Design a protein around this ligand. Structure first.
Ligand SMILES: *[C@@H]1O[C@H](CO)[C@@H](O[C@@H]2O[C@H](CO)[C@@H](O[C@@H]3O[C@H](CO[C@H]4O[C@H](CO)[C@@H](O)[C@H](O)[C@@H]4O)[C@@H](O)[C@H](O[C@H]4O[C@H](CO)[C@@H](O)[C@H](O)[C@@H]4O)[C@@H]3O)[C@H](O)[C@H]2NC(C)=O)[C@H](O)[C@H]1NC(C)=O
Ligand SMILES: *[C@@H]1O[C@H](CO)[C@@H](O[C@@H]2O[C@H](CO)[C@@H](O[C@@H]3O[C@H](CO[C@H]4O[C@H](CO)[C@@H](O)[C@H](O)[C@@H]4O)[C@@H](O)[C@H](O[C@H]4O[C@H](CO)[C@@H](O)[C@H](O)[C@@H]4O)[C@@H]3O)[C@H](O)[C@H]2NC(C)=O)[C@H](O)[C@H]1NC(C)=O
Ligand SMILES: *[C@@H]1O[C@H](CO)[C@@H](O[C@@H]2O[C@H](CO)[C@@H](O[C@@H]3O[C@H](CO[C@H]4O[C@H](CO)[C@@H](O)[C@H](O)[C@@H]4O)[C@@H](O)[C@H](O[C@H]4O[C@H](CO)[C@@H](O)[C@H](O)[C@@H]4O)[C@@H]3O)[C@H](O)[C@H]2NC(C)=O)[C@H](O)[C@H]1NC(C)=O
Ligand SMILES: *[C@@H]1O[C@H](CO)[C@@H](O[C@@H]2O[C@H](CO)[C@@H](O[C@@H]3O[C@H](CO)[C@@H](O)[C@H](O[C@H]4O[C@H](CO)[C@@H](O)[C@H](O)[C@@H]4O)[C@@H]3O)[C@H](O)[C@H]2NC(C)=O)[C@H](O)[C@H]1NC(C)=O
Ligand SMILES: CC(=O)N[C@@H]1[C@@H](O)[C@H](O[C@@H]2O[C@H](CO)[C@H](O)[C@H](O[C@]3(C(=O)O)C[C@H](O)[C@@H](NC(C)=O)[C@H]([C@H](O)[C@H](O)CO)O3)[C@H]2O)[C@@H](CO)O[C@H]1O
Ligand SMILES: CC(=O)N[C@@H]1[C@@H](O[C@@H]2O[C@H](CO)[C@H](O)[C@H](O[C@]3(C(=O)O)C[C@H](O)[C@@H](NC(C)=O)[C@H]([C@H](O)[C@H](O)CO)O3)[C@H]2O)[C@H](O)[C@@H](CO)O[C@H]1O
Ligand SMILES: *[C@@H]1O[C@H](CO[C@@H]2O[C@@H](C)[C@@H](O)[C@@H](O)[C@@H]2O)[C@@H](O[C@@H]2O[C@H](CO)[C@@H](O)[C@H](O)[C@H]2NC(C)=O)[C@H](O)[C@H]1NC(C)=O
Ligand SMILES: CC(=O)N[C@H]1[C@H]([C@H](O)[C@H](O)CO)O[C@@](O[C@@H]2[C@@H](O)[C@H](O)O[C@H](CO)[C@@H]2O)(C(=O)O)C[C@@H]1O
Ligand SMILES: CC(=O)N[C@H]1[C@H]([C@H](O)[C@H](O)CO)O[C@@](O)(C(=O)O)C[C@@H]1O
Ligand SMILES: *[C@@H]1O[C@H](CO)[C@@H](O)[C@H](O)[C@H]1NC(C)=O
Ligand SMILES: *[C@@H]1O[C@H](CO)[C@@H](O)[C@H](O)[C@H]1NC(C)=O
Ligand SMILES: *[C@@H]1O[C@H](CO)[C@@H](O)[C@H](O)[C@H]1NC(C)=O
Ligand SMILES: *[C@@H]1O[C@H](CO)[C@@H](O)[C@H](O)[C@H]1NC(C)=O
Ligand SMILES: *[C@@H]1O[C@H](CO)[C@@H](O)[C@H](O)[C@H]1NC(C)=O
Ligand SMILES: [Ca+2]
Ligand SMILES: [Ca+2]
Ligand SMILES: [Ca+2]
Ligand SMILES: [Ca+2]
Ligand SMILES: [Ca+2]
Lengths: 388, 388, 388, 388
């Protein structure tokens, strides 16, 4: 077994093809399925896994009341092969209400944060054993990616944040080798608020498209040099913006250096990646709610902050149906590196009051250089008929 | 690890012996089993797997209401080792209301079709990753085999159809190397309507026996040259015919080149294979309805369209009991290649009104050169008593 | 991987130590567990498996009514690692209402019998594929061991009976190499009625202790020479006899060549093995019904029919609890071959009328050269409190 | 594969970081989960496993009534990968109402005790087969560690006690090679009563920290030489004592050689380990009953019986939440050996009257040389809402 270095060019991409769907909420009306949220996907050299943060409870269960709450001591990072729903034989790989995982070519790394809001601990679990940990540095909800980290030649990188949800905060980027934190760089550059980065290998470095919860409905970019540990940052230029909330298609604008100040407060986890000067991105369909999900290529959208010219739109989830978090993962092909993404499909409280719980299922697509059609793949559970 | 070539002679066959049975509906009356249809069987070099299209629901579940509908966003391809029923830890391997799978000797190929009726997408998954996709070419329900594809020297072959269920349609044969469509040939020869092919290796080529939903109750044959990508097609000569519906034994007839025009409308997925100039085949016992299942050898049935001489009949499922789709799969022995088949046992709507759902179980038999007796191995569930 | 020769002396045995218990009926009052009967145990070179004939239903399931019936089309052979109860993820390895299994050191052999009473088929499955099959020869309930077969240098042997349950019958010993029946020898010697053999390796051959359902409450012995395929047979000499029913300890007698003719009608699967000229054996404690279970050594019991001298008694299940079938299996140690045994703990109809079903659990013990104590390990379910 | 030697120094430890949590009871309110007690953790060279003593029943089950009882014939040792909850697919590796397990680098050893109180049997299973067994020597509840044993260069060691719970008893240390008891040493030195040892490797030997149920609220220590089989014993010097019950922080005292005589009767399994002259130790937070759990380091606590100087306190479970047993295991890093511990969270009878069963879940922490914060990780089940 060798270390991955992702030392191949990015595949041609013309759009995305369907890859996986777990139907978790529909199955939970007739079986024992975990309540989850904040799911993500990552793969070893042979095959993909789905992760999510459980709630220490199944759906048809009295302990699913009040599961809208994000941080409890019962929350654990769940791990199955992709397309195995989170049944009772699912492995909890650590204690976590915020997490990140990745495989370096030899073994798995997980970064798992739990404990008090004002004094959380991050544990670093590698090849099936604890190897390091850090405390919260700013004592305000230490939190990480909720998607995969990236590893090159044995060095893995992970973005972490501690501090305000609506003001300046303290973002750091960790470099980790066989579970050991070997370096800590601090966030530098134009990015003013950074959370829940979706990162990908872009040899010889790593790149991340994050969420700005403060003043931006445009999305922060973070660039990580894995050899000298240097960091630069900025925003996704595209006139069509990735966050939710945001302004509409006509009213919106963006900027390659600063946040845009356009209904910037709050946000959602999302993704984007470069293809020459064009940008591939996904976002919720609805501008102010987590309803629907779409992807498109914005022509000249990676370098020109005026560009509003999209092409190759696909509806993933129609605008009448719930979506949520989304993020990227990368898959090594024969000659190239592919990009794929997953979409969290949130159901229940507080937006849906027919049930006392909050949970999600997932749908997953992958880059293709071939051709594709249209459809819509929502959660599809009927909450009027769920547990009593 | 080497590619499969299937370059051994077909094994001597005197009939078929019991191999496997899943008892799925019976178990679902007291456990969490998937609602499914369109099952099949395929084996890696070491062992067999059972596949089926799920409905995104378990049976004892509110969402099983109306599972008679065949194409929904929630349909996924299920995959287990043969004999493990589709319980809640079953892996969904891709999004699909139509699919086909094969192992090339090194890894699994899956072909999965989902999306809108008039603009569906076929995904090609090899060795656990998306490698290609193709759009619907005629915008009328792109669909494929619902049984195993066939690989020789690392080239896998799949038959896909797009277009009318009751008229000329566009059928294509794809050639896939490590998930990648390297060539597309179009249907040629005298077969007029081709659907749901049961294919098998017949060195140095591949051979398929299909369903004609239009004018034929004899079954079409497609022959695939794997090296120069040429196609030829025709029909199974045999005067005892394989489709359902069809005419009775005294009234039926056939033709080696054209559809017989006898009760041709509609059909069922089925199988056949040659033995010198004889044919081994299976079919439902009833002519008009999907009731019972039987196999036999028709003497000179592969070359003589007037032969009605069967020997070695076995009853697999008795005629008072429901059957369904069936198809072929090939298993390599020490000196020779064997032939086996599965039979879908459909239960529930719309034919049975005791329940609101539609699902199946399966029974599987394999070629033998030994001896055997008689029995009947139906589904055996009691719908009068099932959940509610 | 190499074939097993079992070419090692038998380990020293002073008695038996507890090895495994699955609590299957106790667990089924609060979970989805298979209904079974006729369990057994066999091990590959690394680990042990539990097998049983399923009834195609779980316990808390309407289909469990009338599971007292021994032969239906829904019965399949279940296979789990020893100590994993038969839950929903359990593999049905073949269709069977009678079976035998063994590993030759390279792969598993399964001998599976299903079909009509008067025309049954025995399937032979080796390394995940059907290699052979044979018809019922006397057209009267073709039946086999219901415990492990034995393989030496790649030739496996198995005992099958077709014919009357209370008269002369046709018993055969088959020689199987990689699933292929290579030779068939017919029963010879003085054994008069032979059923359900518990066989074990005794280099350079195989020995079996079987059930006489006709005239003997002593048990038959069969010696198999694996090289010339010759067969000899007699009975277990011991004055304390192993079948149930039987006469009490003061009234009973035996014969080394003939059935004792003492309450010889009916029987139960049991086991014995030779230690020098003494015999280890188990049996039900109650002489007329399947209640309690016990093991002991009979001094000179293998070579003298007048000996009633037992030493080293162990109670496995106390005389107030239900027992059932029992059989042997052999485990290869560093320097020697150990002998172990399992016991079927039958619950339900007809003997108990508080429930409608009939199932079992199991308890397993192994040979030891060390020391041990006392106890009783019954089924332990409260039928008073089980599902209506 | 080579034998583990543990021939590396103990890692730097600044405290403990969160590792695993199973949420067992919370999940049992809406799924099929085993009732358990006396759990522990042990790892093979790749990964960790969780173990427990099942009550031969699930929680939502009539047979869960009165599971407060500690010894029945239905209790078995359960084994899953760490963080996979005890669902119905869980392996019962042996019959045991007391046990210990360990991996010698090549295969697993399990030591399992079952049978009559006055004549129990201990079985020794290695590489999936029974290799030896020994009887109760003093005919009074033969019992062992309830935590991992320790193996060096292929010699494994385990502590067993037989005799009174409130008087002198007979404690022995067994040396086991590939399952074979090769030597038996009797307890020697100044420790007066010894139960449930938490043992760890300390090259070239093994150290244990145990429970004195007779006259000490300070914990016994046992040192074990693996080459000459010698044994020395004493107590944990620390003026802050680890047993429950015990006297308060201000009133307590200890001694390096003899039991302190302070609320000595009864006890709780627990752990400690040495760091130079310091001791790392955990204990329940309440002095009298099993509530809360804490860890700290005592300065000079290992070698000075007067020190009451603690530092580096962590609450693991808060004072208002039930705790229970706890123990140590050890994990091999690149350069050093880490120490981890688990905590049993008991719920139900007799302390909690709302339900009829008695069961538990677990939380698990590992030594870290990095930094960490605060929190509390209780069981989290609401018993008033549990299956009544
Ligand atoms: C079968 O499936 C395929 C694949 O999904 C569909 O083809 C896609 O259709 C979509 C939607 O129309 C296309 O995305 C759109 O591209 C527009 C560009 O227009 C032209 O651009 C150049 C020339 O300027 C040409 O090359 C090109 O052919 C177009 O003529 C964008 O302007 C669109 O954005 C706007 O429309 C959407 C609504 O659709 C709004 O919501 C946006 O806000 C915005 O106003 C859009 O991005 C996509 O590129 C096509 N893909 C491919 C690969 O060809 C078929 O439509 C589908 N068929 C059926 C019958 O369903
Ligand atoms: C135990 O199990 C075995 C194996 O299944 C059974 O043997 C088979 O029995 C079937 C049914 O009779 C046989 O199939 C039939 O073959 C006929 C062939 O004609 C004769 O010619 C041969 C060769 O010359 C002779 O050996 C023999 O006399 C044959 O009879 C066909 O004519 C039959 O087709 C017609 O009958 C069926 C109804 O049975 C109709 O539905 C058809 O439409 C058609 O009119 C039929 O195909 C089979 O070949 C036998 N197999 C073998 C391997 O021997 C035993 O019968 C069974 N015993 C019991 C008691 O159950
Ligand atoms: C974020 O997370 C960290 C890590 O968990 C917390 O820091 C730990 O806090 C505990 C408790 O405050 C510390 O442990 C305590 O150590 C005391 C001695 O340390 C002080 O004094 C010595 C010598 O005099 C100095 O060298 C040293 O620097 C300290 O100033 C003990 O006295 C304590 O025991 C006593 O208090 C406890 C209650 O805490 C009682 O229950 C005992 O019975 C006893 O009376 C205690 O053991 C621990 O060392 C700290 N860890 C680290 C790594 O610093 C932070 O508190 C937390 N932040 C927030 C905001 O909550
Ligand atoms: C603790 O456990 C040990 C080991 O199990 C146990 O020792 C065993 O006790 C039995 C019962 O006495 C011994 O077996 C007997 O052997 C004598 C010959 O010496 C036989 O005559 C006995 O058979 C007669 O009695 C039986 C009733 O027990 C009748 O059922 C039978 O029909 C005969 O009439 C019997 O086989 C056995 O040899 C020892 N085993 C060893 C290894 O020593 C010990 O007794 C237990 N201690 C306690 C306090 O329970
Ligand atoms: C009692 C009450 O009503 N309190 C609300 C509280 O619910 C609410 O918090 C937000 O609630 C929504 C549910 O609609 C989500 O749960 C938010 O969580 C997420 C998000 O989806 O955006 C999920 C994620 O788990 C969070 N990460 C962590 C580590 O907690 C992120 C995270 O908070 C953001 O990235 C900012 O740091 O948010 C959750 O925030 C708030 C409104 O925000 O209001 C209270 O009054
Ligand atoms: C019905 C009744 O009242 N029984 C009493 C006995 O029960 C004891 O109850 C306590 C809790 O209150 C514990 O469960 C005792 O079990 C443990 C323990 O301390 O947790 C549980 C372990 O499984 C057990 N190990 C074995 C092998 O049995 C262990 C041992 O008993 C001791 O370590 C041996 O010294 O303790 C449970 O026994 C109680 O035994 C008795 C007082 O001793 O009082 C009874 O009335
Ligand atoms: C089972 O379903 C029927 C049919 O419902 C439709 O088809 C399904 C695929 C599902 O997705 C439904 O939403 C569709 O409406 C139900 O009968 C219909 O119910 C609706 C709403 O109550 C009503 O307006 C229509 O009249 C009904 N349609 C027909 C053809 O009868 C029915 O309620 C379901 N059965 C149960 C027990 O829930
Ligand atoms: C293959 C088969 O049916 N095996 C039976 C076995 C045989 O009947 C016997 O060895 C043949 O002589 O015996 C057992 O089953 C019994 C039935 O045969 C009997 O008719 O009814 C009994 C009702 O309690 C009982 O079920 C047996 O002795 O337990 C079982 C086995 O499946
Ligand atoms: C993709 C798809 O819908 N396939 C369906 C086919 C096609 O309709 C026919 O081959 C005609 O096109 O027919 C069925 O309902 C059937 O006969 O049982 C089931 C199956 O789901
Ligand atoms: C978008 O919404 C805002 C409302 O504040 C408004 O400026 C603008 O008219 C809207 N644009 C369109 C196209 O409706
Ligand atoms: C977005 O979602 C809200 C929530 O129901 C809806 O009312 C609103 O009209 C939607 N807006 C658009 C433009 O679809
Ligand atoms: C076959 O069907 C025709 C009706 O079209 C009928 O005349 C004939 O009797 C049928 N044959 C049999 C054997 O039922
Ligand atoms: C400790 O316990 C004793 C019990 O007699 C008591 O006198 C003392 O006050 C207690 N001290 C504290 C600090 O609780
Ligand atoms: C220990 O537990 C009991 C439970 O009733 C409680 O009353 C007592 O106060 C606790 N001890 C301390 C020091 O709080
Ligand atoms: Ca249930
Ligand atoms: Ca924002
Ligand atoms: Ca037709
Ligand atoms: Ca008899
Ligand atoms: Ca004590």
């Amino acid at each position: 077994a060798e270390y991955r270095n992702w030392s191949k060019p990015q595949c041609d991409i013309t759009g995305f093809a369907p890859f996986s769907k777990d139907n978790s909420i529909r199955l939970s009306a007739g079986g024992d399925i975990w309540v989850t949220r904040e799911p993500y996907v990552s793969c070893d050299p042979d095959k993909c896994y789905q992760f999510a943060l459980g709630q220490g409870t199944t759906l048809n269960n009295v302990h699913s009341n009040n599961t809208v709450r994000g941080r409890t001591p019962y929350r654990t990072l769940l791990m199955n092969e992709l397309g195995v729903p989170f049944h009772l034989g699912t492995k909890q790989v650590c204690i976590a209400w915020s997490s990140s995982s990745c495989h370096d070519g030899k073994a798995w790394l997980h970064v798992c944060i739990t404990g008090d809001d004002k004094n959380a601990t991050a544990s670093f679990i590698y090849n099936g054993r604890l190897v390091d940990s850090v405390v919260s540095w700013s004592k305000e909800i230490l939190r990480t990616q909720e998607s995969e980290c990236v590893c090159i030649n044995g060095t893995c990188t992970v973005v972490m944040t501690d501090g305000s949800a609506s003001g300046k905060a303290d973002t750091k980027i960790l470099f980790i080798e066989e579970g050991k934190i070997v370096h800590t760089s601090t966030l530098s550059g134009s990015a003013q608020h950074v959370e829940e980065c979706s990162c990908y290998p872009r040899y010889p470095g790593v790149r991340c498209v994050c969420r700005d919860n403060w003043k931006g409905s445009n999305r922060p970019i973070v660039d990580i040099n894995i050899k000298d540990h240097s960091i630069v940052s900025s925003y996704v230029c595209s006139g069509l913006v990735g966050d939710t909330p945001r302004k509409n298609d006509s009213s919106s604008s963006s900027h390659c250096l600063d946040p845009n100040n356009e209904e910037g407060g709050h946000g959602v986890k999302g993704w984007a990646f470069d293809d020459g000067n064009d940008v591939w991105m996904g976002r919720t369909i609805n501008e102010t709610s987590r309803l629907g999900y779409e992807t498109f290529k914005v022509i000249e959208g990676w370098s020109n902050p005026k560009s509003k010219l999209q092409i190759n739109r696909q509806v993933i989830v129609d605008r009448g149906n719930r979506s949520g978090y989304s993020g990227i993962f990368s898959v090594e092909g024969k000659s190239c590196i592919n990009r794929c993404f997953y979409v969290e499909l949130i159901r229940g409280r507080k937006e849906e009051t027919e049930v006392l719980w909050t949970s999600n299922s997932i749908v997953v697509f992958c880059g293709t250089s071939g051709t594709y059609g249209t459809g819509s793949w929502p959660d599809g559970a009927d909450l009027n008929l769920m547990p009593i």
